[PDB]
Design a binder for this molecule. Structure first.
Ligand code: ZN
Length: 636
RNA sequence: GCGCGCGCGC
RNA sequence: GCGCGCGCGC
């Protein structure tokens, strides 16, 4: 409802900024920080005497936030009659930018647009803005675009260049506290964030706290450490089936062990799942396709096994075995070549040991007893509770549902996936009104007597959420403390942190390096075929790398990109790959650039070989590779 | 293609 | 820092 009366706490928060102070406004998500910024932005613009005129820039980090604040600000400042506009990576690259800023009063931007136009010098000073609003301002640190912008601000403020400087405003729900393990290190971190934004005030709700607390979702947090089964023989057996089908894949693909860059994979993990993905991706489905289709069968079978171990981990062995029983029922009912019928046979040789390990009652899952008990209590306390349960995987949703309906001690419960249903089970949220929230072994609250239960067997997950709570304490205590300082004392502290930080940036400027200047071969990382030479390579727009000549065009084949994107300098037409029918390693992309159809390469697709010595070096990033970096020439 | 943030591991 | 992964940007 950002399209229609302030609560008192919005007035309280708006006040310091309305007084001309650089403020970080820190308030919970969804409490109306946006409205608060509409109030501040109205006041600022209307304050100027007739004859004078403000200009406001609002920074947004993601396209959807950009889109929605552009509509909101546009919507709101009609009747006032100010000109409202936006610029993102799409409001490009043929809009005259210093002229858009000129002819508008409220400009909504992604930060990088501004960073580029300061860097290119098209916008010479931040002085054309009278107010700057940073959404999610806690991002103003390290090398983030917000911080680059403030580096430009502070360079003007400290090195004296009048030049009036805009007021600066930041919006967040959480400021602190970085890698801090002490309350004193929390305050240093928070003081550094203010300094980064030249803020002298942190605005929080102090006087209208009790009004705020009525509308804030703050559930009672509970942590419950559970033990898992001591012996899992079901896992041992599947694990051997996974070794069986991994070795069958090595037969068809030697050096499977290097077909993905993911290391130390383990069965029954998310990370194994991702290994499977990268491998299927590194083998798209002429003669190489027949090998990759065979590999697809193996890896899609390992995926099901992998899904099954996870189900067994958190729900019951039955649930895991039934999942596989279904799957293999599909395999014969829609196939069913050599590999497939061999694979399901290897399974069937094992089905019956798995069957009896499954029904073995000493093999029951003790974690489910804990979930069950938590459920009973809540409902013999309030029989009309609405629970949402969060689990790891699509398949676990089904596991837990069958479990619930199958449990005599949950009777009583009516599961769904709004409504004649008490428990919603799901994976991610997208479709507060929930008085019970269970995170069953779920991998907290980034969105009435409500409470959140956290159930896990992992001690480190408990630890992490207790550390997080302790950080939130330190944050809130630090803020309280610094809000008691006289603003002048605080501004003097901030001034010399800025002076100190500026020195570091200016001192620690990375020296321009000596290039090695000699010609090196670029070879394919995967097959090792010679791609090209370093003397054939040219640098486009400082940061991108291309190869000259007709000789190279034969070494790569290209392939259509499903969704082609247009950036600042080029349009990503295609993905490019090695020319051999039996490698197809990802080499980079193909762009339309200044009407040229040229290839763009990533160094991580190649091995750099020294010619005379055959010695090789791997590089992840081009900026680490110090060779003679030759500028691209528009007619060469 | 490149850049930035965050999480896990050493 | 290195590796891997997630997210977002031009
Ligand atoms: Zn190759």
């Amino acid at each position: 409802n950002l399209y229609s009366k302030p609560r008192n706490y919005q007035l309280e928060l708006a006040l310091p900024a309305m007084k001309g102070k650089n403020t970080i406004i820190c308030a919970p998500t969804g409490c109306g920080k946006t409205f608060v910024s509409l109030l501040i932005c109205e006041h600022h613009l209307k304050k100027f005497p007739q004859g004078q005129k403000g200009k406001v820039v609002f920074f947004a980090n993601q396209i959807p936030v950009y889109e929605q604040n552009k509509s909101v600000f546009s919507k709101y400042f009609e009747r006032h009659g100010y000109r409202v506009t936006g610029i993102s990576g799409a409001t490009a690259e043929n809009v005259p930018v210093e002229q858009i800023v000129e002819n508008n009063d409220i400009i909504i931007l992604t930060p990088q647009i501004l960073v580029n136009n300061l860097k290119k010098g098209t916008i010479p000073s931040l002085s054309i803005f009278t107010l700057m609003i940073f959404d999610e301002c806690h991002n103003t640190s390290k090398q983030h675009p917000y911080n680059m912008i403030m580096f430009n601000y502070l360079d003007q403020k400290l090195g004296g260049s009048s030049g009036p400087l805009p007021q600066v405003i930041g919006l967040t729900a959480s400021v602190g506290v970085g890698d801090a393990k002490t309350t004193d290190e929390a305050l240093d971190y928070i003081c550094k964030l203010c300094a980064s934004l030249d803020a002298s005030v942190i605005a929080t709700v102090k006087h209208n706290l009790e009004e705020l607390e009525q509308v804030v979702y703050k559930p009672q947090k509970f942590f419950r450490k559970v033990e898992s089964r001591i012996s899992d023989k079901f896992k041992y057996i599947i694990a051997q089936l996974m070794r069986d089908t991994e070795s069958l894949a090595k037969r068809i693909c030697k050096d499977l062990e290097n077909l993905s860059q993911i290391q130390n994979r383990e069965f029954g993990t998310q990370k194994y799942e991702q290994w499977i993905v990268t491998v299927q991706k590194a083998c798209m489905v002429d003669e190489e396709s027949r090998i990759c289709k065979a590999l697809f069968l193996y890896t899609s079978h390992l995926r099901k096994y992998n899904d099954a171990l996870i189900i067994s981990e958190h729900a019951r062995m039955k649930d895991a075995l039934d999942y596989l029983k279904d799957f293999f029922s599909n395999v014969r009912a829609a196939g069913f070549d050599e590999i497939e019928q061999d694979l399901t046979q290897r399974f069937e040789e094992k089905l019956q040991e798995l069957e009896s390990v499954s029904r073995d009652p000493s093999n029951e899952n003790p974690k489910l007893e804990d979930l069950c008990f938590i459920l009973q209590e809540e409902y013999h306390l309030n029989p009309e509770t609405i629970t949402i349960l969060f689990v790891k995987t699509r398949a676990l949703v089904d596991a837990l549902k069958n479990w619930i309906e199958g449990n005599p001690k949950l009777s009583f419960l009516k599961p769904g996936i709004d409504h004649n249903i008490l428990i919603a089970t799901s994976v991610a949220d997208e479709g507060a009104q929930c008085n019970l929230v269970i995170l069953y072994e779920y991998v907290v609250i980034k969105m009435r007597g409500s409470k959140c239960f956290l159930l896990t067997s992992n001690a480190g997950v408990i630890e992490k959420e207790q550390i997080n709570m302790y950080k939130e304490k330190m944050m809130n205590d630090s803020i309280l403390r610094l809000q008691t300082w006289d603003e002048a004392v605080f501004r003097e502290k901030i001034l010399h942190i800025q002076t100190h930080e500026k020195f570091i940036r200016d001192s620690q400027e990375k020296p321009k390096p000596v290039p090695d200047k000699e010609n090196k071969k670029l070879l394919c990382r995967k097959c090792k075929a010679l791609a090209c030479y370093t003397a054939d390579v040219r640098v486009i727009e400082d940061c991108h790398y291309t190869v000259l000549g007709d000789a190279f065009k034969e070494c790569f084949v290209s392939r259509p990109h499903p969704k082609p994107k247009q950036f600042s300098s080029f349009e990503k037409r295609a993905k490019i790959f090695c020319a051999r029918q039996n490698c197809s390693h990802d080499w980079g992309i193909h762009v339309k650039y200044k009407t040229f159809e040229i290839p763009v390469i990533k160094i991580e697709s190649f091995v750099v070989e020294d010619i005379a010595t055959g010695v090789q070096t791997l590089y992840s990033k081009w900026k680490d590779f110090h060779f003679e970096k030759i500028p691209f020439d528009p007619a060469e």
